[PDB]
Amino acid sequence: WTATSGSCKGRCFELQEVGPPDCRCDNLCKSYSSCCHDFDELCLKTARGWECTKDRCGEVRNEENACHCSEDCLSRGDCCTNYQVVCKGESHWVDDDCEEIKVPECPAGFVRPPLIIFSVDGFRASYMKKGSKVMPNIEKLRSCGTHAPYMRPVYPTKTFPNLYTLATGLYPESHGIVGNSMYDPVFDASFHLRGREKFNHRWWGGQPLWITATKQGVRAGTFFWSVSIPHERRILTILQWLSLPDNERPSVYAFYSEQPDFSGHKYGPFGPEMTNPLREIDKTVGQLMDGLKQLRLHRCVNVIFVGDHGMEDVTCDRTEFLSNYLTNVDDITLVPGTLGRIRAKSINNSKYDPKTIIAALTCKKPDQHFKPYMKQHLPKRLHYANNRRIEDIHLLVDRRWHVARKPLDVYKKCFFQGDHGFDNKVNSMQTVFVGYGPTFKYRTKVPPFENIELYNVMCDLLGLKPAPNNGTHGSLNHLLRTNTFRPTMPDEVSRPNYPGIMYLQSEFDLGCTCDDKVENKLEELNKRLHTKGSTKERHLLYGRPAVLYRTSYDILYHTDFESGYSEIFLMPLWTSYTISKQAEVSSIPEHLTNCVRPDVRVSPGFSQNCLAYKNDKQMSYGFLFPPYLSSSPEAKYDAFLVTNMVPMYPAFKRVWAYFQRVLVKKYASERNGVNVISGPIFDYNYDGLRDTEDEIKQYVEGSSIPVPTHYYSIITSCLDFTQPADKCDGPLSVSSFILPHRPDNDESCNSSEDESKWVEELMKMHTARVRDIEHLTGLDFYRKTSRSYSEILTLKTYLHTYESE
Numbered sequence: 001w002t003a004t005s006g007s008c009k010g011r012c013f014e015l016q017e018v019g020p021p022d023c024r025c026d027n028l029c030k031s032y033s034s035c036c037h038d039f040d041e042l043c044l045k046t047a048r049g050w051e052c053t054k055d056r057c058g059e060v061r062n063e064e065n066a067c068h069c070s071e072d073c074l075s076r077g078d079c080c081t082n083y084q085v086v087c088k089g090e091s092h093w094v095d096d097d098c099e100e101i102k103v104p105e106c107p108a109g110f111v112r113p114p115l116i117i118f119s120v121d122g123f124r125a126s127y128m129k130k131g132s133k134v135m136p137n138i139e140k141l142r143s144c145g146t147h148a149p150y151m152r153p154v155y156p157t158k159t160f161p162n163l164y165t166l167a168t169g170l171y172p173e174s175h176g177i178v179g180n181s182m183y184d185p186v187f188d189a190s191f192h193l194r195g196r197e198k199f200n201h202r203w204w205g206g207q208p209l210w211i212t213a214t215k216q217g218v219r220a221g222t223f224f225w226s227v228s229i230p231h232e233r234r235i236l237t238i239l240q241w242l243s244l245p246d247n248e249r250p251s252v253y254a255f256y257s258e259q260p261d262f263s264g265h266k267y268g269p270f271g272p273e274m275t276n277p278l279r280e281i282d283k284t285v286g287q288l289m290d291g292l293k294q295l296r297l298h299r300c301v302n303v304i305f306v307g308d309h310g311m312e313d314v315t316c317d318r319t320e321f322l323s324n325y326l327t328n329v330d331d332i333t334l335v336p337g338t339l340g341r342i343r344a345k346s347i348n349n350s351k352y353d354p355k356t357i358i359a360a361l362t363c364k365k366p367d368q369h370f371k372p373y374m375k376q377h378l379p380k381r382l383h384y385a386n387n388r389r390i391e392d393i394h395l396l397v398d399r400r401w402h403v404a405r406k407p408l409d410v411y412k413k414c415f416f417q418g419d420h421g422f423d424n425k426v427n428s429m430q431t432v433f434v435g436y437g438p439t440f441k442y443r444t445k446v447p448p449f450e451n452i453e454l455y456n457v458m459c460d461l462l463g464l465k466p467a468p469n470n471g472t473h474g475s476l477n478h479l480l481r482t483n484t485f486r487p488t489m490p491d492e493v494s495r496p497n498y499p500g501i502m503y504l505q506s507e508f509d510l511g512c513t514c515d516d517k518v519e520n521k522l523e524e525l526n527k528r529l530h531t532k533g534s535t536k537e538r539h540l541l542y543g544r545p546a547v548l549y550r551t552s553y554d555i556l557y558h559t560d561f562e563s564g565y566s567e568i569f570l571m572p573l574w575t576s577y578t579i580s581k582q583a584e585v586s587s588i589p590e591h592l593t594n595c596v597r598p599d600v601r602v603s604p605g606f607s608q609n610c611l612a613y614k615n616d617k618q619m620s621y622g623f624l625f626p627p628y629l630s631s632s633p634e635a636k637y638d639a640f641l642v643t644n645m646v647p648m649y650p651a652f653k654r655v656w657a658y659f660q661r662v663l664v665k666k667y668a669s670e671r672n673g674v675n676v677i678s679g680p681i682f683d684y685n686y687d688g689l690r691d692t693e694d695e696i697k698q699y700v701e702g703s704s705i706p707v708p709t710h711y712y713s714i715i716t717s718c719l720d721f722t723q724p725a726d727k728c729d730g731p732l733s734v735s736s737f738i739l740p741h742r743p744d745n746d747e748s749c750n751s752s753e754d755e756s757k758w759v760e761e762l763m764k765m766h767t768a769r770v771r772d773i774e775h776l777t778g779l780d781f782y783r784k785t786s787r788s789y790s791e792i793l794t795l796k797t798y799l800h801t802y803e804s805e
C-alpha cells in the first residue's frame, strides 16, 4: 500500500528515497508503482522538445517546458543541452579539438572530480570500430581518453550478473546474482527479471560502489532509472544534480541505457536495424558532454563508458532439446537458453540421479551443441560453483545455440535473432571500456582486462577504500594519470628448510625399485654443487614463490629443476624448470620404466611409497619435472626421485604425458625458451581457495598421500621473443592452465583418438590467470624481477584466451 496522495512539488528526483505508505518522487518510484499523483506532470515534462531553436533564445521562462532557453537557465542549471550552441554561438563538444587534461579544471567548491558512469547494455566490443562512422562523440571519448580494445565480462554473460559485478568487484558466485533467473533452496524463493522478488535485499551480497561511497562520506546520486523515463530526462536530471550546492551535490552518478541490447535481441548483433540505436546512444553522449561543457564541467569530470556484455547471432532453429536425450524429461527443471542449469523437479523423488543424467547428456550426437558438467568440473577461470543458487548440473552451450527442455517451450513461449550469456572467453561476448577525464591518461591504449577490476579503480577515482573484492588492486594502475594505489608484496609466512643428505638408502621401506647401482673426482664436486643450488639461477628465473600460509616445507635443488616440497602433503607445492629453444627431448630408457628412487634428504616418514600405488587399483603416478627433458643421461636419475612423484589417474596420464613430451618443447621453439612452474591444486569444496589438509576427500588407498583435484602450469618467456627466456631484459609473456584431475576423459568427445587431436584443445579450455593459481595454492609468484610491481600485477591477471582476432 501507498497513500499516493502527497505531492512532488519541489521534490522532483529527490536524492534520499522516502518511506511507505508516503509517496515517492525518486527516479525509481515508477518501478514500485509508488509515485505521487503529480509525478508525471511536475517531473516528466516534455513540452516543446529537447533542444533549443533560434526563435526560443532569450524567451520568457515557461515552467512547463522540458528544458529552457531563457537567460536565467544557466544559473538555474536547467537549460537544454544545446542552449549555448544555438543561442550564444558556442560549438558542440565533439567539434572541439581535444586537449590534454593535465589537472582537474573544476568550479570553486568542488572537493574532488565527479565520476559519471555511462553504462550500455549489450554493447559488443567490435561496435567501436564497426560503428565508428555513426558514433562521433563516443569515438572522441575513445581516442582522446584511455581505451581497451575490449573488456572481458564475467560468466554467465547476462545483464544482472555483469552489472552487479561492475558495482562490487565480485564474481557472481560471491555477490549472489548468479543468473538473470534463480532459485534459492534455503530461502525457498525465486528471483525473476519480471516482478517483485528481485527487489528484496537478501539476494544482493557484497558491497556495491554507492554503499561504499555513502559509508565513507561521499554522496551518491541514485544510480537506477525506471525504464519509461526517457534518456533525455536522465541526462537533464544528472546535469541538474550537478548544479546543487556543494553540501548536497553527489560526487558519483550513473546513467544506464537499455540499448543496444534491446534491439540486438530482435535483429542480431549486426542487423542493419542496428545503426539507428548506435546513433541514438551517441546522440545521448553528445547531450551529456554539451551539458557538461555548458556548466564548465567538461575538463573536470571523469567519465567511464562501459558495457555489461556483447551480443551473438542466435535463432530458434539452433536449439537443442533435452527431450532428444532423456527419457525422464518431466522429472527435471531446466533453467534454459545460452546456459543450462538442471535440478530435480521434486525433492520428494529419490529415484532422481544426477550421474545418470550427466551420462545420458555425454557425447551422444556427432555435432552436439552443449556439454554437461558437474559444476565443480567447470573450468576454474569461470569461477562458477561456490553458491547454493548454482545447480550441481550445468550445461555450457556452444556460441550461436540454445538449450531448451521440450520443443513446446520454444513455440508456446521465430522471434529473436540475438542472445548472450555464453562462456566469457567468447569474442562476441566481449564488451567495451573507455575512461575519459583528468585522472585518466591521454590518448592511451591499454590491454584487455576483466570487469571485476573496475570497482577498485572507481574507488581510486573517488578517494575510497574498496570493500574486500576479487579484483587485484594495482593491476589497472596503468590506466591512470594519478590516484594510483601503490601496493606491497604480501609477506612470506613460512620460510623453507634446506635439507642436506641425512638418510641412508636402507632406511627406506617404500616398496620402490630402480635399476640404478652403476658407479670420479671431476664429476662428484659437480653433482654436489648441483644439489647445493649451482644452476638455480637457470631454473628459478623470478625468485622462489612465497608461501603465504603456515606450513612445513623444503627447498630441493637439482641440475634440471628446483622444487618446494611439502612435508604435510608429501609432494611438491611447486616445481620450477627452464627449457631453452635448443633443448632436446629424449625417451625414458627401458631399465628405468618403473624406477622410483628414495630421496636421501627427506625422511621415509615424509615420503610417498610405491606399495600404496600398487594397492590402489584406480590410481597411478606421474612426475612434475618431466623425465623426457633431462639435460643428460646422468641428470635423468633426479627425475625419478620419489619427491618428484604425484598421484595420477591413468586417464589423466594421457593428458600429462602429451603436455610434457610434446607441448613443452613446442612452446620452447615457438617462444625462444620457456620457464615452467608446475604443481598440484586441492579444491574439494570448489571455493577457488587452497584447501587445508582437513578438507581433502581422497587419498591414495591406504596411505596419507592426498589426491589433487587439479594440476597447474605457469609458462613464462620474454615478450620480445628475440631474447631467450633466461636472458630477458624487458616485459614478460605468460600463459597458464589449471587442468582438472579426472579418472576419465568424458569431457573430450574425441579422446579415443590420438592425443594430438584432443589434448591441446582441452588445455585451452582450462586456460587460467596466474592470479587464479595463487588463490588455489596460497603462493605468490614473480617475487624477484627487474619489473615494477604494478606491471607484475597486470601480468598475473592476464588470461590467454585462444580466440582468433
Ligand SMILES: *[C@@H]1O[C@H](CO)[C@@H](O[C@@H]2O[C@H](CO)[C@@H](O[C@@H]3O[C@H](CO[C@H]4O[C@H](CO)[C@@H](O)[C@H](O[C@H]5O[C@H](CO)[C@@H](O)[C@H](O)[C@@H]5O[C@H]5O[C@H](CO)[C@@H](O)[C@H](O)[C@@H]5O)[C@@H]4O)[C@@H](O)[C@H](O[C@H]4O[C@H](CO)[C@@H](O)[C@H](O)[C@@H]4O[C@H]4O[C@H](CO)[C@@H](O)[C@H](O)[C@@H]4O)[C@@H]3O)[C@H](O)[C@H]2NC(C)=O)[C@H](O)[C@H]1NC(C)=O
Pocket (backbone or CB within 6 Å): 170, 171, 173, 174, 175, 176, 202, 203, 204, 205, 206, 383, 386, 387, 388, 468, 469, 470, 687, 688, 689, 775
Ligand atoms: C572473491 O572475494 C570475496 C570477498 O573477499 C571472497 O569471499 C570471502 O571469503 C571469505 C573466506 O571464505 C569469507 O570469510 C568468512 O566470513 C564469514 C562471515 O560471513 C559474512 O560476512 C561478510 C562480510 O559482511 C559477508 O559479505 C558474507 O556474505 C555472504 O553470505 C550471504 C549468504 O548467506 C550473501 O548475501 C553474500 O552474497 C555472501 O555469500 C557468499 O559468501 C559465503 C561465504 O561467507 C558463501 O558461503 C556463499 O556461497 C557466497 O558465495 C557473510 O554474511 C565467517 O563466518 C567465516 O568464518 C568461518 O570459517 C573460518 C575459517 O577461517 C573459521 O574460523 C570459523 O570457525 C567460521 O566457521 C564457522 O561457520 C562454519 C559454517 O557454518 C562452520 O563450518 C564452523 O564450524 C564455524 O561455526 C569466514 O571468515 C567472506 O565471507 C567472503 N565474502 C564474500 C562477500 O563472499 C572470495 O573468497 C573471493 N574469491 C576468490 C576466488 O578469491
Ligand SMILES: CCOC(=O)c1cc(-c2cccc(Br)c2)[nH]n1
Pocket (backbone or CB within 6 Å): 117, 119, 162, 163, 164, 166, 167, 209, 210, 223, 224, 225, 226, 254, 255, 256
Ligand atoms: C537494471 C537497470 O540498471 C540501471 O538503471 C543502472 C545500473 C547502474 C550501474 C550498473 C553497474 C555498475 C554501476 Br557502479 C552502476 N546504474 N544504473
Ligand SMILES: [Br-]
Pocket (backbone or CB within 6 Å): 163, 164, 167
Ligand atoms: Br546493478
Ligand SMILES: [Ca+2]
Pocket (backbone or CB within 6 Å): 682, 683, 684, 685, 686, 687, 688, 689, 690, 691
Ligand atoms: Ca578450497
Ligand SMILES: [Cl-]
Pocket (backbone or CB within 6 Å): 156, 158, 178, 179, 180, 181, 335
Ligand atoms: Cl540465467
Ligand SMILES: [K+]
Pocket (backbone or CB within 6 Å): 613, 614, 615, 616, 617, 618, 619, 620
Ligand atoms: K595403481
Ligand code: NA
Pocket (backbone or CB within 6 Å): 745, 746, 747, 748, 749, 750, 751, 752
Ligand atoms: Na572421451
Ligand SMILES: [Zn+2]
Pocket (backbone or CB within 6 Å): 122, 159, 261, 262, 265, 420
Ligand atoms: Zn539482453
